[PDB]
Amino acid sequence: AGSRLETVGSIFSRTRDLVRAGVLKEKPLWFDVYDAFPPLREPVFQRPRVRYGKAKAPIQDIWYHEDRIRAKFYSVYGSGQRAFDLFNPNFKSTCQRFVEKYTELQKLGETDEEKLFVETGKALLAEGVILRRVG
Template sequence: MAGSRLEKIGTIFSRTSGLIQTGALNFEDRPLWYDIYKAFPPKEEPKYDRPIPNMKLKQIFYKEDKIRALFHRNNKQIGAINLFSAGKSITQRFIDTYVTLLEQYKDREEVSEEQLYKEAIDILNKGHQLQRDTALDSETISLSSAYKEARRKMNNINLKDIFQ
């Protein structure tokens, strides 16, 4: 037996409005997006049979995306990131180091991408060893202690404050 073909009749907003009007759906049980859609309707209704607009999509790539991809391709086991730390992630530190080296060697054409990568990794490893020795590395925090810290911070949040 074939599935429902109701998606071809009207829009999701008109179908939801119909359910609310007939009482099949309580107004209090309406979806979260319903009020937003009602306040800010789209310029063109998203109908099933609307033709696809013929427009060129922009490529959204930043300069550091290529560097980030190179780093993550070669370093698959980076570990957890503590989102509560004020310091930079290891990926961001690598990008900063790589860009700094790129600026230093921009006049030299014989420096390859691989050489820059190796030198940036060496600098990061030296810096990482120094931080371990001085116990300042924020990324060596264990997952369990990071979880405990996050739970402690979550306990201080009042839901009334969020919705005001």
Template structure:
């Protein structure tokens, strides 16, 4: 079978049809794709001897925001975690673009836009982190878990006392 050239004769559809016609495959055991293939045949028949398609160069698609994003990420910003469970949650990059447009409309010079936008987004992120950490409040402040959480210092968690 190693020297078989049968894959060059016909298409996969004609071979499966032949197997079904001659009893090699029962109609109930036909592949899942068979009915879909018959209902929606390809525009170009997938034959082995088909000539190779013309290779066209891929056109670059760049938006104005892509340049801003590239500069922002090259400065080391925008790599924060994103909670995918929150629909409509904004990434740092999206917040930067909003700040960038806002500052640009206010007339901030072009060379300072990225730095100022990044600084604003970073300060907003720090405030959000501080607000989230201060929101951790136990339901029962006298429980053992609440006492442990109150004494927990995550920055120095691995230091011995």
């Protein structure tokens, strides 16, 4: 006669309490496994709410420093003609190659953003990349 009050406690708590009370004569098959290796959270029903005032979801947008370089690249040269192949885990786009070259040039000790951009463009041209500016 397992309690059917899924809103009152968790299945583990209800089963345990009924066994203690004597309503359940035998522990259900899963009780020992649960008690041995419980989940990281006890599954207790919680009614969801909608945030109303100044409360906001704690999810933070995933940004990286190279995102600035990527945005500048896409604004200056566009997507390009080399279509992304997202199946390959090691795929590198023209933008990613530009980002790597920009990063190493910065490591060399250059601070000017526009100079880094133009130098990276010329370096990629030397390497043999057809960086077609959109404008």
